[PDB]
Design a protein around this nucleic acid. Structure first.
Lengths: 301, 296, 94, 84, 175, 76, 133, 97
DNA sequence: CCCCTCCCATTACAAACTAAAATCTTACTTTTATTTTCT
DNA sequence: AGAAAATAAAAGTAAGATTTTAGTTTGTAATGGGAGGGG
């Protein structure tokens, strides 16, 4: 009967819902953000421990020597321009081949949408992204990662040299990196605000309150002498970085919990402002210096 | 005896051509264009074709990302697409280049005299030197005057070998531009060090979590930043200045006064041709027609 | 009626050939590339496409330098470029 | 200024063979040597070339080698420096 | 109002197709007549899968829109023609459009089983959802526990929207 | 072997940049710029090849070498 | 499982995450249709255009980034989170659209206009010439 | 007007002399006010250590020294008697802006 | 197995100090560049 | 017009006084391992 057709219809929907990664990465972001907002005013220690120990960082952290997952999309289509778990140049060349497939899909999707608006029929034999264009985009993507890696390597060498002489990335960093590559990230920044700030405000935090059973599990010790005030008075430096202060063993769990709550609130405001300005650019003074022009070269007698 | 005015128009006309240099009939360009009823493709106007070919000579197609602004209505696909057809057409076309004329040593001697004479008359129209700048401004020009008499006056560059003892004076309009330049760079520097560490908060020990900028972070930012950020390091500038001006200085002694800035320098560093004969003849004729024109 | 792709005029082909022709001869440039490789004590071998890519990027660099060199001559109210003009452009760019 | 352009045309015509001379060829040579803008008053400019092209059939064709050009260029250059 | 997901187009090629040769010529199309008597190939950008018969009839599956299905069908016909079999693109016909929407209101499906059980069936063992068949316009729709009402069997966008509008008040009530 | 780049090559290159007349003593200076730039691109091309552990230099290595200098190249 | 990449390669990643937290709170899943529904007011105002969630296959981007980093940049292991991968897809989509946009007026806007469509245009009359395709 | 016809040797004393904090081209107090004003654009509680301001000053002074060197080279190229605005504009043009 | 508080050994490092290298003051001679007289 | 002489400017030489840099010492906070308990 029609049940088999309906069963096949249901399986396709479930298969499509499983395959797409963007919505699953977003759901992980929304789960962590909603949990903190609903449980930051009270029980910050419980929710921080609950998130950190159960929804671990390695849930979405990448890349790893593990999770070498081959999409293998170049063996599926023809409308296009290795042993499992292998890490080699053959795998790298294989990875680039499937990247060009993804760029081709974006190229054809953009043109097809524009053609319909402007009422133009397209020749299907020329919709392929040009090889020179795609090769340049792959170089750009490669240069994006080597810029991040170069900064880490140079910073490590700087720290090592000073020591001898003396003796995590989020969408904020990706936006900042694009600005360093002299790209206009105003459009992406506006889209990032909607996805990461405006949409989560629609959710009702009352639904994401931690249950009593979980709260009792992650209880912290109580009635312990605080050491932050004594530590701050006797310190030598005028300012103490929060990251150094969070890992210090002279502070009790309650001391760190209050600092972590304050740090999370202040960092988010600082991160939002930092990428807002980096997108805007430092040329806000608008006191532009005129360029060497034709008028500066002519001779009058 | 009017070579001076004749040279001036020659210079002025050449300068305009060098700047405003950007013939071709309008046509529709399509990806299937093959060889040398309605036409199909994208419209390429005469001013667009002229701009495309002039830009191609002045900048390679590899720099299309920059000069595509001169073709506002043409996307990078259309510009690169047009280049692809022409390359295919040119290689498939039947075979059969402007040169720069090599001038004699006598011509450049005459031209230098003409150019120097022109600057003498036009020197009266130049802006005059300023009176004095005070401590309200960022730049202290007294230090610059002391530098020139002590460092740059010893330069061994042959082309500028007779060097004035004292630095050249600056006009008032020039000083304003320099004041604006350092303000622009200060914004660039702050946005690379102060804004970068905006997200790293600290605890006010000797009392919110403020953001603190330290010399450790500034030097780290200067050394580990991308070289395209054009961030300058003072100890690195000193060695570059000595090489640039070919100054002679002792090498045994220590260049930097303090170990900290000497250390900072170390951190930054580790982070029978018939073509020729034809061109010679054309150049000799080209110089001949110019000399006759001036000799009139 | 017939819908036909717009033809490229022959004067457009000649202008394109004038603009994009590789002015440096391939053989002398190839020998210079080999000398640099052996002067680096390098056993790596350069493909023909790699040599062509090196050449076509050299012309783009040289043309850009001559454009800056002409600006130096213009600044001195001169219509011909000299050795001192290239030296000034090199010093300021570097 | 029209008389000034006439001298330029006379100089240019004195060193090119008259077999393949075209009004466009001389007009191109004007921009190549003297950088004068031919687009403005183009019709007036073209009249001068045609007028001057009739007068150059009288004299004969004299071809001077590279050596003659080099020695005469030196004479003109050193002489021009003296007036300055 | 509901968003369509799957589109199936019916395109007939005038020529007679040899499934064995086209599979070898195609880069990634897989053909095995033992299980299925059609050539399977997919294109990336429209994300459409086409079934290629030896008789020349071709049905594509996975288009996000009717116009995209025509574009996807053209590419499928172009690929077949590029082999050299002289296929022809004629008689384009959309045969089924599948649309769905989420009411965001959790609705129990047990009540709709017996409130109107003549044209609607709910076999919990056979299907997790409720089978609902409404007469006019002719679209088959399924009721789920969460409320993700899906619609299938329509022809164009005008009909599929009106089907939702008729059942919009029904899904809001009967909590 | 730097003399392989002959005089007519430089004269035509100068005209492309807008230079109409040249001194005639600049050829040796241009060749110095010729070699110096060629050193940097070859050095980075070989360096990028070692990091890929390959035994030859291809056009992509030159493209990546120029990208590190902020210069674009199109592989037509 | 231990990853969302393995969970997205009958049980979905949402179910794995729900059992990872013992179903303490509902899992906030937002489909593409719902995501666009919550930005339609700002989309109408023109504050932004296009989709805010990438359509590119992030699995392909992840595999390329894995191979690139594990072969050349070993200091980037585990250095990114979910938001970095989502934003990376948006930035890659931006690079492709960069090669197609132009300054077009109707004030001026930087959009995709006449040019790229007509440059590869083809008028087809299937009624009389169905062989063009 | 005076000229040095024999380029001598730049001894280390005046090379080291202008590496001092008091001999820098950038002035102490005006630079501090400029830094604070620019930092005021960032709407956050941002504070500078005393040594941090000094470190920024050396970097800023290095840029100005380079700009002065190229501006003077352009002025000497044009045989100017007074450095003009277009000399700065030419140097920036030849520096890649 | 991972959380916590607490211990304790070592190391980092700013402050104070000593010391040696650099440089400033005074005076002088000697080389370099400008200007006056002369042919 | 050019040279040759005159004069003045500049740099070089020196020693003793004074400032700056470089080395050492030292106190104590900073840092991380570890045991122990508790779940």
């Amino acid at each position: 009967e029609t049940l088999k057709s309906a069963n096949e219809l249901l399986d396709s929907l479930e298969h499509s819902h499983r395959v797409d990664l963007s919505l699953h990465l977003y759901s992980a972001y929304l789960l962590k953000r909603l949990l903190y907002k609903a449980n930051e005013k009270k029980h910050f220690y419980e929710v921080n421990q609950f998130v950190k120990t159960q929804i671990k960082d390695n849930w979405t952290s990448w890349p790893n020597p593990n999770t070498i997952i081959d999409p293998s999309v170049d063996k599926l289509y023809e409308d296009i321009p290795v042993q499992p778990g292998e890490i080699s140049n053959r795998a790298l060349m294989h990875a680039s081949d499937m990247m060009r497939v993804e760029l081709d899909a974006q190229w054809q999707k953009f043109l097809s949408k524009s053609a319909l608006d402007h009422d133009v029929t397209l020749d299907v034999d020329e919709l392929n992204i040009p090889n020179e264009i795609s090769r340049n985009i792959l170089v750009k993507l490669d240069s994006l990662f080597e810029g991040l890696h170069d900064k880490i390597a140079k910073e490590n060498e700087f720290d090592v040299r000073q020591d001898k002489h003396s003796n995590k990335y989020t969408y904020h960093d990706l936006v900042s990196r694009g600005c360093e590559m002299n790209e206009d990230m105003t459009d992406i920044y506006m889209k990032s605000l909607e996805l990461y700030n405006d949409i989560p405000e629609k959710y009702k935090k009352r639904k994401f309150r931690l249950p009593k059973q979980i709260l009792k599990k992650y209880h912290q010790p109580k009635k312990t002498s605080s050491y932050l005030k004594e530590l701050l008075s006797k310190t030598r430096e005028d300012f103490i970085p929060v990251e150094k202060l969070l890992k210090d063993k002279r502070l009790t769990s309650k001391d760190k919990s209050k600092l972590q709550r304050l740090n999370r609130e202040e960092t988010e405001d600082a991160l939002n402002k930092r990428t807002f300005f980096q997108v805007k650019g430092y040329l806000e003074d608008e006191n532009e210096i005129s360029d060497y022009e034709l008028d500066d070269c002519l001779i009058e007698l | 005896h009017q070579q001076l005015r004749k040279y001036v128009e020659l210079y002025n006309k050449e300068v305009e051509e060098f700047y405003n240099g950007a013939e071709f009939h309008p046509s529709k360009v399509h990806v299937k264009s093959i060889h040398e009823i309605s036409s199909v493709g994208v419209d390429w106007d005469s001013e667009e074709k002229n701009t495309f070919f002039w830009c191609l000579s002045r900048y390679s197609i590899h720099r299309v990302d920059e000069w595509r602004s001169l073709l506002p209505r043409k996307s990078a696909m259309e510009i690169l697409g047009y280049y692809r057809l022409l390359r295919r057409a040119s290689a498939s076309a039947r075979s059969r280049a402007p040169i720069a004329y090599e001038m004699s040593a006598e011509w450049v001697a005459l031209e230098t005299k003409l150019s120097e004479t022109v600057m003498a008359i036009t020197e009266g129209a130049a802006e005059v030197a300023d009176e004095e700048g005070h401590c309200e401004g960022l730049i202290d020009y007294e230090s610059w005057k002391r530098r020139w008499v002590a460092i740059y006056s010893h330069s061994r560059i042959a082309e500028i070998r007779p060097l004035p003892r004292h630095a050249l004076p600056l006009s008032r309009s020039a000083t304003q531009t320099l004041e604006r330049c350092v303000s622009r760079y200060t914004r660039t520097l702050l946005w690379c060090t102060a804004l970068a560490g905006m997200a790293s908060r600290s605890v006010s020990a000797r009392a919110s979590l403020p953001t603190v900028v330290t010399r450790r972070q500034v030097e780290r930012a200067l050394c580990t930043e991308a070289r395209s950020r054009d961030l300058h390091v003072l100890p690195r500038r000193i060695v570059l200045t000595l090489r640039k001006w070919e100054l002679d200085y002792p090498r045994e002694g220590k260049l930097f006064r303090t170990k900290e800035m000497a250390h900072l320098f170390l951190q930054s560093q580790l982070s029978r041709d018939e073509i020729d004969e034809a061109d010679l003849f054309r150049s000799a004729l080209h110089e001949n027609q110019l000399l006759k024109w001036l000799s009139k | 009626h017939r819908y036909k792709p717009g033809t490229v005029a022959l004067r457009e082909i000649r202008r394109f050939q004038k603009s994009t022709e590789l002015l440096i001869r391939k053989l002398p440039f190839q020998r210079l590339v080999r000398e640099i490789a052996q002067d680096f004590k390098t056993d790596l071998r350069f493909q023909s496409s790699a040599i062509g890519a090196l050449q076509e990027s050299v012309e783009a660099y040289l043309v850009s330098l001559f454009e800056d060199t002409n600006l130096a001559a213009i600044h001195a109210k001169r219509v011909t470029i000299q050795k001192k003009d290239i030296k000034l452009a090199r010093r300021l760019r570097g | 200024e029209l008389n000034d352009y006439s001298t330029m045309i006379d100089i240019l015509l004195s060193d090119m063979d008259l077999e393949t001379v075209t009004t466009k060829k001389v007009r191109m040579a004007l921009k190549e040597v003297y950088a004068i803008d031919v687009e403005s008053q183009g019709k007036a400019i073209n009249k001068l070339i045609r007028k001057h092209l009739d007068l150059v059939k009288e004299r004969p064709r004299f071809e001077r080698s590279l050596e003659d050009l080099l020695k005469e260029n030196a004479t003109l250059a050193i002489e021009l420096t003296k007036e300055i | 109002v509901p968003t369509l997901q799957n589109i199936v187009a019916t395109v007939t090629l005038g020529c007679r197709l040899d499934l064995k040769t086209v599979a070898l010529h195609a880069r990634n199309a897989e053909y095995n007549p033992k299980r299925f008597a059609a050539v399977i190939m997919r294109i990336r950008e429209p994300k459409t899968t086409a079934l290629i018969f030896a008789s020349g009839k071709m049905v594509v599956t996975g288009a996000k829109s009717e116009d995209d299905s025509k574009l996807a069908s053209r590419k499928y016909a172009r690929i077949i023609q590029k082999i050299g079999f002289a296929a022809k693109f004629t008689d384009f016909k959309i045969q089924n459009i599948v649309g769905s929407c989420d009411v965001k209101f959790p609705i129990r499906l047990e009540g709709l089983a017996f409130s109107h059980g003549t044209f609607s069936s709910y076999e919990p063992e056979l299907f997790p959802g409720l089978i609902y068949r409404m007469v006019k316009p002719k679209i088959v729709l399924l009721i789920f526990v969460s409320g993700k009402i899906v619609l299938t069997g329509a022809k164009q966008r005008e009909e599929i929207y009106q089907a939702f509008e008729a059942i919009y008040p029904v899904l809001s009530e009967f909590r | 072997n730097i003399q392989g780049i002959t005089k007519p090559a430089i004269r035509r290159l100068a005209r492309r940049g807008g230079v109409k007349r040249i001194s005639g003593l600049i050829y040796e200076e241009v060749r110095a710029v010729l070699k110096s730039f060629l050193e940097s691109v070859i050095r980075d091309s070989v360096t990028y090849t070692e990091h890929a552990k390959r035994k030859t230099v291809t056009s992509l290595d030159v493209v990546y070498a120029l990208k590190r200098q902020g210069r674009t190249l199109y592989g037509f | 499982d231990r990853n969302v990449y393995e969970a997205c390669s009958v049980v979905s990643a949402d179910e794995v995450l729900a059992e990872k937290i013992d179903n303490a709170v509902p899992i906030p899943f937002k489909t593409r249709e719902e995501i666009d529904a919550d930005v339609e007011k700002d989309r109408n105002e023109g504050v932004f255009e296009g989709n805010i969630i990438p359509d590119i296959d992030l699995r392909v981007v992840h595999y390329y980034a894995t191979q690139l980093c594990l072969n050349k940049y070993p200091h980037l292991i585990n250095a990114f989170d979910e938001t970095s991968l989502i934003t990376l897809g948006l930035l890659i989509e931006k690079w492709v659209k960069d090669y197609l946009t132009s300054i077009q007026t109707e004030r001026q806007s930087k959009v995709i206009g006449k040019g790229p469509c007509e440059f590869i245009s083809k008028h087809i009359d299937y009624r009389h010439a169905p062989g063009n395709i």
